[PDB]
From Swiss-Prot, chains A, B:
The modification N6-(pyridoxal phosphate)lysine is found at residue 246. This is Aspartate aminotransferase. It catalyses: L-aspartate + 2-oxoglutarate = oxaloacetate + L-glutamate. L-aspartate binds at residues 34, 130, 183, 374. Induction: Transcription is increased specifically in response to 2,4,6-trinitrotoluene (TNT) and its indicator compounds 1,3-DNB, 2,4-DNT, and 2,6-DNT. Homodimer. GO terms for cellular component: cytoplasm; cytosol. Belongs to the class-I pyridoxal-phosphate-dependent aminotransferase family. Keywords: Aminotransferase, Cytoplasm, Pyridoxal phosphate, Transferase. It holds the Pfam family Aminotran_1_2.
Length: 396, 396
């Protein structure tokens, strides 16, 4: 049976890892995958989480199957964190949430729900975009089409080119928006541009699906949900695929949520029921550990207090490593003017290096960036800066 | 968008939980979902588990993304428990293993891999079978045909209707077997009956797909893997969906595995890149806790030793709950002769009860079995024995 099977091509991102993990060179830097690092070059486990885990250790009496929808309380929490204190979405009981294996699994769940229970045939995804967006959607049968976004020549959001693109989307189409910290550009639309698309997309008849894997690294919690919050006000229906792998450091435990919002509760209920079935034929029920951490924390004032500060801390060191990055570039002999890098939010930076640059940075200096020229600021440290900035400077 | 969505009818097993949960009558018993219970009727967390968790607590420095295929250890270990320490398979590097969100997720990973890369068209699954095999396979767009298996009248494995109903299996079809502990019958083919099927399947050109989710509750670890190991000798190609949910009480952390057998290293290799690819479009990478807890315990002679006993002890108490069940049954009324029960393996028993019988125990006595009339031995205790045996008796 498998004599004919053909070797697939590796994950452009995740596959880099393997590569990295294999060079035996000394000074190898890894600006690949989006991992938050600390000053001392490591991927710590936050403190609020070890505290959460200890609590679990001494408190857990069973490993009982969770519901298909996970821990209720983790849901309440995701919602509040998503919509706000006493939103009508919550007051109206218009949202139903499901704990899933990461934000990558909230996607896959969404798209099996859409295709099986809807008339959705197409999903529009920005250009550029997170390479897995397509494969996820494709796998559920859906067609993926791309809209314009990124003004190369000037490092922004080309609004009108964006708008003009989406004028080709039929009603009933699904439009895919990154909540904040666009991956991999780092550019995000103002509150007005969100208010815009918000009105538009309502008139145009689109289904908006928000990929929110970074609440907290742009400006902060409550303010990084604005776009999303503008949308909710308008729409009767929407879907959000959220991740807690970056803001809780829980990468390998897989914590995320799939939120569904309908016109009302009777609906949402009916609709949610089908979502479950989508799960039940996938993985059945979600993993406990990681999500129980999340609720525990979000539920406790002290622990929360602690986590929030851990967050703002992660964010601030990033904002720091970015200023530091250009400065040194500048101070190191860099052709281009990189200051547009200080206009990008989140863990990355859409560098501007060509495929052959990124290819050379690696074979020749041991540096590791995604071929799009995506660079992970969070992987930058005062101890690697110089050497880093020197290789780049040599390849430019 | 969601205005015409048809509510779905709930999972037949998990759905039962909901009902149990919301029921308020004091003496309610729950013989539904396959969860191991203790003398006092709790679903305790194994000592070897707690122990390994502690270890992780103290020693975990990171939550870094696992690989697509998970913890190498975890795999290396799974194949061993699957094929046996010395096995050629291992020595021939013909197996590849991916850590997954349970036995469910492995099933699904199997389906999405087949579907997408094989030209497999139909999957054959017993009658009766576990109700999710269908849903899983369908959702991958596969045809589910049934083979015959259980001989009601004398409660047994009719090898005859078995062999005859599979005569229509086609070459390239996929035959699906429960390695041991048949859910929901509890009847298994003998090493001989196994030796034979292995012979056919070869001769008739089938892809066997083993569903192993209870290794250790029949006879014991190595004993229960006979059928599988017989197959492994003959076959060149094989698929195995394993789960640790029951033998390690890890129900809610989703731990199981998917093993791919091929003729050679190169093959399995190519063929596994494809599998990974299928993983990347679903959930990305596996959840770490639970699996880490398994490699921990299986790589440590000591905790291992502690493990193998908690298991042995779970089995023993089950077998005791069996012989006590019939004993109290007879000794309490019973027209029927339930003596065939003692001949079933694992947590359940195909009771021989009526749809309308289980509807009444539930409604009138708080008892909770599945509709097929499948009862959990494991959810039986010395304290509840009487009261259950009374209602069952009053509905005969
Ligand atoms: C925008 C975006 N959305 C979702 C995800 C996946 O999040 P999880 O919660 O499932 O981890 C990511 C992840 N992006 C990171 C990490 C990653 C993970 C898997 C694969 O295949 C590739 C990358 C990244 O490297 O950009 C998003 O970025
Ligand atoms: C026969 C069978 N095969 C596989 C599995 C996989 O369970 P995992 O928890 O490892 O994924 C099971 C488990 N079935 C139990 C519990 C259950 C699980 C999911 C759903 O939807 C319903 C019940 C059972 O009671 O049969 C098998 O049983």
């Amino acid at each position: 049976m498998f004599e004919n099977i053909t070797a697939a091509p590796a994950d452009p991102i995740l596959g880099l890892a393997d590569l990295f993990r294999a060079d035996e060179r000394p000074g190898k830097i890894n600006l690949g995958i989006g991992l938050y690092y600390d000053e001392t070059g490591k991927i710590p486990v936050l403190t609020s989480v070890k505290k959460a885990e200890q609590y679990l250790l001494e408190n857990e009496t069973t490993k009982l199957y969770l519901g298909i929808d996970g821990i209720p309380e983790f849901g309440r929490c995701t919602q509040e964190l998503l919509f706000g204190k006493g939103s009508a979405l919550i007051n109206d009981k218009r949202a139903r949430t499901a704990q899933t294996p990461g934000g990558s699994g909230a996607l896959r769940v969404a798209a099996d729900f859409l295709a099986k229970n809807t008339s959705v045939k197409r999903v529009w995804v920005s250009n550029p975009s997170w390479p897995n967006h397509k494969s996820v959607f494709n796998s559920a049968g859906l067609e993926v089409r791309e809209y314009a976004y990124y003004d190369a020549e000037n490092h922004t959001l080309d609004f009108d080119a964006l708008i003009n693109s989406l004028n080709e989307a039929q009603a009933g189409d699904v439009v895919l928006f990154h909540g904040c910290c666009h991956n991999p550009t780092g550019i995000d639309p103002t509150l007005e541009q969100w208010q815009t698309l918000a009105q538009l997309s309502v008139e145009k008849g689109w289904l908006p699906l928000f990929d929110f894997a970074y609440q907290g690294f742009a400006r902060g919690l409550e303010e990084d949900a604005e776009g999303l919050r503008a949308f909710a006000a308008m729409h009767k229906e929407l879907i959000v695929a959220s991740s807690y792998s970056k803001n809780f450091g829980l990468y390998n435990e897989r914590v995320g949520a799939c939120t569904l919002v309908a016109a009302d509760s009777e609906t949402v209920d009916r609709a949610f029921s089908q979502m479950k079935a989508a799960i039940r034929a996938n993985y059945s029920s979600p993993p406990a550990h990681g999500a129980s951490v999340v609720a525990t924390i979000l539920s406790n004032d002290a622990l929360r207090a602690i986590w929030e500060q851990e967050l703002t801390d992660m964010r601030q060191r990033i904002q720091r490593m970015r200023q530091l990055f250009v400065n040194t570039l500048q101070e190191k002999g860099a052709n281009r003017d990189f200051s547009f890098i200080i206009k990008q939010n989140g863990m990355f930076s859409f560098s501007g290096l060509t495929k052959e640059q990124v290819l050379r940075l690696r074979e020749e200096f041991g540096v590791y960036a995604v071929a799009s020229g995506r660079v992970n600021v969070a992987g930058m440290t005062p101890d690697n800066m110089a050497p880093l900035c020197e290789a780049i400077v040599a390849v430019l």
